């Protein structure tokens, strides 16, 4: 394992099976009682073989448990089929986002399988992206229907769950959204000659007669919207939800569907099948949550990609969408492990994300004429324009909310999910081209008074910040942020940073009693009460 | 069209239908009476679309006719099916090596054609590579069975010839070798679950019951050798021939056969389907020309690729093979038109070719022990080793003949084809990494002095040198070289350079009365007597 640099983060992690108390410096509030589960990649080499993409590493989950003003750390691999098969074969066996599976001599274009492959859907279950709450439990997810319930206290892998038993989808996001009733929404792709994006809701099994309090059984299709090009449907990482609407971008990142359906024979990864179609406008697709009907407006924007939406809400007949905008994501080669090991991913200017707002008029007034900015009468919409076109469509321009590049956006879900709001917290892990020292950004959506927490040295890397509210608080930022601080150097111990969300001033940190924590993805904080 | 640079060479050429006398400076020998036909790419744009690879341009043939101490120039497109379809087009209609045609909406994996595609074979007849003599005529060839007879005087496209009507191959080289009897040898690939390399002879249609004196009908399989990996057979550009043997390299450039067979659905070019398998040794495959039996020796080398073999001959029970060795050819992306337009192709150090010799022992003595260099008692084999292996195989190492990078090798075919010899003439068109000005190289295979003719300015590009013998001569180099000098500048007229082969000193040049001649490939000189 290398002493310093990003290669250090790509050596295999080992289980930390027993929770270890972490060295605390500072103080935490009385309401910091709960458990944060973090998902991400942890196994990058198997024997002499190496995974290719950041998204590929086998899921290695961590538990950050807060109790009596202390923090306890543990970590374990997810016991997926992908993991078990690879550990038992000491070879890369299961396909992942960007690494080939072992070639099967019985699956060639000259074998009988070539006559059966359309009947088959190969299970991809490296659920290393995030955790999704369903009733009383958390499920580890990736961008497939194949999930695992995970024990909050022990990180034990419990039973598998197959989303596609309830709705016919081939892929789906690992970023399901949920509301105050605990109902869980997703969008998935059903591939075919008329590929469609399928919008789903899963009712909270606790609020209804169910087989158990963590069941997915109450899952149904809300509606669906066809891909513009059925053979090149958009890739999708996340989507947005307001009180009444679900919204997605038809991005320039497209899946080459015929190549993916044949990928076993042409020996292509899912990653190989992504293409950047810069010659096409982005479209906004909006579905009514109650009727399942698509909003009848054509909504076009200049090309861009977003991994993550922030919050989404309705105001004055408009749909407000915040998201982290990337000018040209390509096909995500920037996040190949070879390009991250050098650190050069951080300086790919066209790939860096910036928090961005777009404002969609949900109706066009009868007095409006082509060329009119339909937002001109919306005072709070300054910096966005949504211009009526000659053909009745609308062209939307965005406002960059913050000049500091940021991603992994989070907000005060308990108070203002699906409502007008002021703050987005994010991380600068993707990089920066202006030399800024920022690690965590608190972006101000109303007055532009942004706050930052700076990385203390070049070996610190900020993870996704999680907002935990003060139960006795009233303002949107009355709470703390939990921020995992990863380390790319043996000179820097990893730690969990606790910030006052109002000021981004540190109140405590907890040093991890291990040399490394993963260059990970998303985390979920479950309060004890 | 730009005033200067390689982009000049990638604008479409226009027909020059009538021979134009060229401005002569200097003097030529009395025996320079004959016709040189040159093949190469000339049409690179169709409407606003552009072909992608150097190998793609539709064939544009030139005639350089030497007579009465004069040279006459004319040029015309080859009237293939591809050309005929394309002039009547506005987008790329005929697919080539590295460019797709427009997609057929009825040929998706969801259509009935997906059940029929293995029965269908699309004709690729852009015969733009070289000319091959068969009886009394010349045939324009590419790396497919589809050829055209071409009139020596008018460049008129005559009748098509389909090699696959006489032997079952899917592809074959455009670098057929021939002997003093006018027999024509090739190697072609028959793809399938046990892909094989098929070795062929075409008996001179003269001296035999034939439909005419240029017929391919007397074509038979000499034998065949299976690919080591039937789904990854080697790409092949050329091969070698001695008095009694045919020899080919199983190179690291491999065809991804499954991807190629499915290329209509995954929208891949043949070029896209080439891959560099750097982790594999090169194998030498040798076939006896008379008996069709494969040499029962296993012969391995460190990876490399060669476009062009030079001469090949037997001596003292060994098989001597000369060829232009490239360390890492990748999948030929260096020769994409985008990378040639910038001139940067000339400085890809691992892609540059170097004339090279390897020496194959055709038997292993009973006294030989593993670890023995089987060439140790062969005095002239210095710098080469063929070391017997523990498993009975032979591992061969090569000798770099000349330190100046060179390709398009030619030799004094009339005197020493298939015999021991001294000289290879070549061009530096592929580039150089040391800034040298060399244009034409005369390499000495007997450890002698290599001679060079230097380009006069950076806008001169040397084509393939052809050796024309002095009939009164005795020495191997008693003759002249004909060298097309292409121009990348409106300040430089293209011309044909006539060099004394003994000294590589110019005796004459003929200025072409056109602004450009193509960045072309191979040429054939047919003497008038
Ligand atoms: Fe994500
Ligand atoms: Fe060639």
Residue numbers in the entry:
A (entry chain A), B (entry chain B): 1 to 529
What did the study's authors say about this model?
Purified BCMO-1 was crystallized and the diffraction data were collected to 1.8-Å resolution. The structure was determined by molecular replacement, and two BCMO-1 molecules (chains A and B) were found in an asymmetric unit. The two chains are highly similar with a root-mean-square deviation (RMSD) of 0.20 Å, with the large differences occurring in the helical dome and reflecting the relative flexibility of these regions. BCMO-1 has 39 β-stands, 5 α-helices and 11 310-helices as defined by the dictionary of secondary structure of proteins (DSSP) algorithm. The iron is coordinated by His175, His237, His308, and His522 from blades II, III, IV, and VII, respectively. The substrate tunnel is a bent cavity passing below the helical dome. A narrow neck unequally divides the tunnel into two parts. The main part of tunnel (also indicated by the orange dashed line in Figure 2) runs from the entrance located between helices η4 and η5 to the iron center; the minor part heads to the interface between helices η1 and α4, which is likely the exit passage of the product. Trp54 and Phe430 clamp the neck of the tunnel. The ligand observed in the active center of BCMO-1 was modeled as an oxalate. The dicarboxyl groups and imidazoles from His175, His237, His308, and His522 octahedrally coordinate the iron.
